[PDB]
Amino acid sequence: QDALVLGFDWGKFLKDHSYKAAPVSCFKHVPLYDQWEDVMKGMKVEVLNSDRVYWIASVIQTAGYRVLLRYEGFENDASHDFWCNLGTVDVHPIGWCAINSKILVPPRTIHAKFTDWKGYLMKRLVGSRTLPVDFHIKMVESMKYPFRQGMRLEVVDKSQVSRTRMAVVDTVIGGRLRLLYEDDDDFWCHMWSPLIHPVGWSRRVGHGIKMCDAVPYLFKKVRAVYTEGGWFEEGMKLEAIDPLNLGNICVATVCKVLLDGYLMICVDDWFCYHASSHAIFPATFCQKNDIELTPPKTFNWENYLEKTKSKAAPSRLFNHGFKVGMKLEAVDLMEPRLICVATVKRVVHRLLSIHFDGWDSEYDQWVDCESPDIYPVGWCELTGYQLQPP
Length: 390
Description:
Blueprint: H1 10-16, E1 44-48, E2 54-63, E3 66-71, E4 82-85, E5 91-92, H2 96-99, H3 117-125, H4 135-142, E6 152-157, E7 160-173, E8 176-181, E9 186-190, E10 196-197, H5 201-205, E11 208-209, E12 237-242, E13 245-257, E14 262-267, E15 271-274, E16 280-281, H6 285-289, E17 293-294, H7 301-307, E18 327-331, E19 339-348, E20 351-356, E21 365-368, E22 374-375, H8 379-383, E23 387-388
Parallel strand pairs: 7-11, 13-17, 19-23
Antiparallel strand pairs: 1-2, 1-5, 2-3, 3-4, 6-7, 6-10, 7-8, 8-9, 12-13, 12-16, 13-14, 14-15, 18-19, 18-22, 19-20, 20-21
Subcellular location: Nucleus
Protein name: Lethal(3)malignant brain tumor-like protein 2
MBT repeats: 8-107, 115-211, 212-296, 299-390
């Protein structure tokens, strides 16, 4: 028992501490997102009986992809409750045993409760919901990814974030890509990462670049931006999450206007943000929202604009269910191969502060609520990815 070290168990973690998990419906980029919440408490499934025979269980609690199940017949007895990740093969809709010549057997723990188990189950199933038709089928289908090993793309260079660099796709897992540079070092991101781009992008838009190809339609397209009046102009001041230090929201400047609504932003090296990005904010955003602003190398915006003879980028140029204390799995964007137990520490409109459980607060990351680098509880289990414990 003590020999079998399988790593982090969300179940043992969440039971002890009465924690809430961000639900699957908060994450648009994950498997089963579009089939979810036809998952709810009291839903009935056929599952393996562990005390190959199956039995019926009911959802007591949900945490990301994982459901806490209670075998039918236990009623209020919670001592045999068990967790099930809904991305596994051995959870089924009611009726599945009948079509697959399988047999329903009560757990040995409660088998002597009733003689007429069939009648008991009938009374328990009247008006019950079960899993969708083709639920696991629609899931393995959504997890055939457009990005394949061998596809070439442009990725911002971690060592010089003001240029892109060529990379070949190496591994695809759950929409996450492992990248290898054209010229032992590697890079992990999500297929929706604003960091990756089709070949010919940088030259087209005016982005610095070090210097078969994945085609434009494989890549997440950005939002159109509407504004009455002028655009962003070089020299305009704002606030931006520092890409090199994601715990920090910094005093920043529009350093270059590129094509297609893209901007090179500098901290007062340059980094490209789209104008629709949620990682840029109008001057005084942090002050209005009780977020520590990182000043240039007692900061005050009016005084700064004055000392520097600058203007603030106008507010009109800038453009879910998460709650403080919710658990999730978060990429450590400083080492993106690592996905870790995390907690939502702050919710400020669209912005989340994600805290890595066990790690110091300096390691906290600001990310948008729709970031592709945060995942529900059970996600690493569902895809086969390794989760880092607290």
